[PDB]
Amino acid sequence: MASKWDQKGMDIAYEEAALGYKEGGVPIGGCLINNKDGSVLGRGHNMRFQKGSATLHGEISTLENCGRLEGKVYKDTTLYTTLSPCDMCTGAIIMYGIPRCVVGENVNFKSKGEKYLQTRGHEVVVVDDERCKKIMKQFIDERPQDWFEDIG
Amino acid sequence: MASKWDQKGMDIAYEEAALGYKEGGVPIGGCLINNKDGSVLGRGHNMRFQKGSATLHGEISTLENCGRLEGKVYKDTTLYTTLSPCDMCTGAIIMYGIPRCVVGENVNFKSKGEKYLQTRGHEVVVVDDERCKKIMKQFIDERPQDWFEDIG
Numbered sequence: 001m002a003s004k005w006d007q008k009g010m011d012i013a014y015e016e017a018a019l020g021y022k023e024g025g026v027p028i029g030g031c032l033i034n035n036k037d038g039s040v041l042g043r044g045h046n047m048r049f050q051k052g053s054a055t056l057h058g059e060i061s062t063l064e065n066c067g068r069l070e071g072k073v074y075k076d077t078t079l080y081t082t083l084s085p086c087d088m089c090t091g092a093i094i095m096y097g098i099p100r101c102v103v104g105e106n107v108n109f110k111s112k113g114e115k116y117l118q119t120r121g122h123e124v125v126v127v128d129d130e131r132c133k134k135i136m137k138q139f140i141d142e143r144p145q146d147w148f149e150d151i152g
Numbered sequence: 153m154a155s156k157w158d159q160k161g162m163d164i165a166y167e168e169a170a171l172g173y174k175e176g177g178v179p180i181g182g183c184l185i186n187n188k189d190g191s192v193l194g195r196g197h198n199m200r201f202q203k204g205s206a207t208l209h210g211e212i213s214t215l216e217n218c219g220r221l222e223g224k225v226y227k228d229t230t231l232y233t234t235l236s237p238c239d240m241c242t243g244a245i246i247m248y249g250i251p252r253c254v255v256g257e258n259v260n261f262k263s264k265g266e267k268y269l270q271t272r273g274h275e276v277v278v279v280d281d282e283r284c285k286k287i288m289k290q291f292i293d294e295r296p297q298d299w300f301e302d303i304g
């Protein structure tokens with residue numbers, strides 16, 4: 001199945017979110033996995049506060065840490081993210097042709113990109129991961145100014 | 153008028169593209185300008201080869217160089233880019249709520265994002281700048297492997 005590696009992918013993505021949370025950042029993590037053998041091409045988390053970055057969302061940092069890959073490689077991967085992607089991270093998935101996006105939870109945040117991915121021919125799976133929902137609920141509760149001055 | 157600062161914005165964007173050419177990168181540049189007084193919030197160019205970056209497109213590098221701005225600031229800006237935006241840079245404009253995007257040319261490259269911006273309620277102006285067309289035509293001719301292994 002396409003979902004053979006989904007527990008591994010979301011577990012790494014959550015580890016990145018928890019790591020970024022301990023660093024004082026937004027707890028959003030991700031990873032990119034080769035669908036063929038489950039190998040991890042890259043992993044990362046939101047770097048808004050760690051690097052003062054306006055663009056290093058969790059999904060962007062994940063793709064940046066993968067490095068410049070061959071176009072054919074992206075076409076058989078799954079992008080795992082703990083939080084439903086914004087319009088920019090949605091566009092990155094579309095631009096690289098990543099066919100599958102697995103999302104931890106879309107309760108705390110959702111954009112039009114989740115539906116746009118399906119319109120553009122991508123598969124979107126929302127797993128409703130309770131670990132992801134809890135860590136982001138805590139961030140929104142404890143740091144509402146940081147959240148709502150950002151994607152909130 | 154709304155186009156009061158458009159010659160200034162594209163001139164800065166082209167200078168960034170030309171600077172990226174001298175550094176050995178893809179000649180795609182941009183800048184973000186406050187529509188109220190024409191002040192430059194940030195400028196940048198494609199850093200794929202300068203930093204080995206998969207995500208630092210010209211528009212992304214421009215927004216990164218602006219720093220973390222207040223949400224209200226983005227709402228009255230124009231993003232200038234020498235080349236029509238890919239789906240990722242299109243999504244970045246949408247996510248930040250930048251209402252206006254002025255494009256140097258869409259001859260050398262164009263994605264579905266140009267129309268998607270208008271679908272999402274953004275203004276897109278294509279100026280057909282001959283300087284931008286020439287420098288990107290030269291890059292595609294001289295470095296077809298680099299171009300077609302990327303968004304080409």
Ligand SMILES: [Zn+2]
Pocket residue numbers: 057058059085086087088089090
């Ligand atoms: Zn995002």
Ligand SMILES: [Zn+2]
Pocket residue numbers: 209210211237238239240241242
């Ligand atoms: Zn782009």
